[model samples]
Target chain A: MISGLSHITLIVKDLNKTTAFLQNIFNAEEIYSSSLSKEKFFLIAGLWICIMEGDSLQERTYNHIAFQIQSEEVDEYTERIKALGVEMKPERPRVQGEGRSIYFYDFDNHLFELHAGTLEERLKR
Target chain B: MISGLSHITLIVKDLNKTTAFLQNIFNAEEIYSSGDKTFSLSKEKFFLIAGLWICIMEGDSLQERTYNHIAFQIQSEEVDEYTERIKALGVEMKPEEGRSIYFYDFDNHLFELHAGTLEERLKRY
Candidate 1:
């Protein structure tokens, strides 16, 4: 039986850009990197993130991963991510009780979302 | 500061097939569905798999398959059980060098069920 999310692996165009991106915005800690392989491991909020150097997607898609954040930290994160010159997707409309979200794409065209609410709260509303 | 993963959204071609896949394999609970609403880019459904939110949106399938994937934790003893479940769905599995079941969904999105944790993997490395 499946228990929990173990890790997310992404094939990126440049490891350095992604390394900086994860560290700056999410404060991801680099745990491992192999000189024999085009890969690196990071821990962001206890979640394992594995990134490999490879060809990126030719175009963008709606598929993404959303991370939890406090509602008050939205502005702080906004500036932090903006300073990195990352491409930010326009914010999606939100209902009053669903909390807030910030959607963006990574250097490799992977979409990511920073959501400020829980499923329990969103469903109850 | 960013706290943890809130949700993961995947753009798939067929929601019905993906719906059954998640329910059967991961025992995911369907929490929400946008029946006639376009709250997201298109029709979408939300599910909870081991407390993680997974959202699937109706869209075109991925044109190509790559190493990008999301993995879930599974007990080593249940590895064959999951293999049976995935094979029963007629899903294709990729050959790899690790004790992980790497498979693709109906829409070409790769997923993995691994029996090891980061600590175990790091220790081996």
Candidate 2:
């Protein structure tokens, strides 16, 4: 039986750009890298998202997504995303954790993250 | 700092059909279930992939991607796309593990998996 998802693989147009964007925005740490076509990143949430460069587009049509963060960091996170040389939607990040979150796409046109705390924690905070 | 991906969310047309198709094909186990717009599956690999039912699609324009689904109990994992119920192109599953590996899409149009044994083990097995 399938236990759980190990990672999501994405084909990227530019490896350096995508990896840099992820690192600066999400603070994703590179777990593995090689001369080959694959690079892996570890999110603070403990999931692995990989980007593989290919000469030609594989038939697979895939996109990217982001995880929710704690509440108090929502505004700061959004500001950080804006500083990354991308225009962002101005909605208040949804309060999934203690604060709220907002999501947007990255340079590769992949959906990316911006989340706040959870509802339960929001009530107390 | 993001540690890892906790889950991925996809928009689906038919939850019941997609859910069943995944269950039969990959043997994904449902870790969490709810009446709200979300449902999650735990793959054999231990990553969470989720599908969220939405009334109107969000502007995010996000697409579904597949985790490398591990080998199956029957058919020695998939030799190529042609083996499955869906019409698949003939591509040899790469030997990531003991046997070989192949990847395809699910009913919701998300990339799916088919892997054999690892290369090191394949040499021995």
Candidate 3:
């Protein structure tokens, strides 16, 4: 019925902080934003990541969105995001051959994941 | 850097109801489940919807509603069909604006089906 994902919108508190975090951390390029509006759009890993104003942002939970990455780059991403003063949650316990992940929180206390794993690999583990 | 979206997860109330909703409404296929044969407990289910991985976990529903959402690319004609179908499922369909159909899942998570391609949306900006 549908093609695929168009975008994922996050209810963020501050557009300025979110911008810096996305640009510096994800290397996302700002495609569109309005000074008059509280919404901004960026291209992150070829996907449109949209952040809009939230009257009340939600707390950090296990409910998070994850993006794929090179397994070796988990350390790189972790260090990059860490240098930006972002809060990194304790690494989740993993099985031997499941995969690697770096979990962190964005400006609005939203949890995000950068993981390197495939369905076949996970099933085998 | 991250590659792209690996998965999007939502917290729902009932696993059975959520499973049926996705399978019957969105035509999503259940690919994996975390529940075992020994214990009857809340569990997570992964579904492949239009090439995107949607993970649903049984948990407390969100109390606040916001513009935060996930939008999908769809055919122009399919918008009309989804509007009626989702409405009939009592999903609280919202009025259409522009070329999109908006609705909420059982967990208050917003979703959109836009009748336009990514390139087309880029041109709007």
Q: Which one wins by lDDT: 1 or 2? A: 1
Number of the predicted model whose TM-score against the real structure is largest: 1
Misplaced by over 4 Å in model 3 are B37-42, B96-98
* Local error of candidate 3 at residue A74 (angstroms): 1.0
* All DockQ scores: 0.79, 0.19, 0.70
* lDDT per residue as tens, model 2, A11-90: 66777887887778777767666545565544445545566665434232223355656556667777787788675655
Candidate 1 local lDDT, B1-125, one digit each (tens): 77889889898988988999999999999988874545434678899899888988898888888888999999888888888888899889886624799999988889999998899989954
Q: Candidate 3 has which clashing residue pairs, if any?
A: none
Q: Of the candidates shown, which would achieve the greatest lDDT relative to the real structure? A: 1
**Model 3: per-residue lDDT, tens digit, B1-125?**
67788888788888898888787667898888875546755578889999888888888887767777788878887877877778888888888525898988887777888888657766964
Q: Which residue ranges in model 1 land beyond 4 Å of their true spot?
A: A56-58, B37-41
User: Could you tell me which residue pairs clash in candidate 1?
Assistant: none
**CAPRI quality of model 2:** incorrect
Model 2 DockQ, alpha carbons vs. true complex: 0.19
- C-alpha lDDT values of all predictions: 0.86, 0.45, 0.80
Task: Score residue A77 of candidate 2 by CA lDDT.
Answer: 74
lDDT by residue (tens digit), candidate 1, A1-125 = 57899999998888998898888888899999876569999999989999999876636787788899998988888887788888887877776668888877778888888888878787762
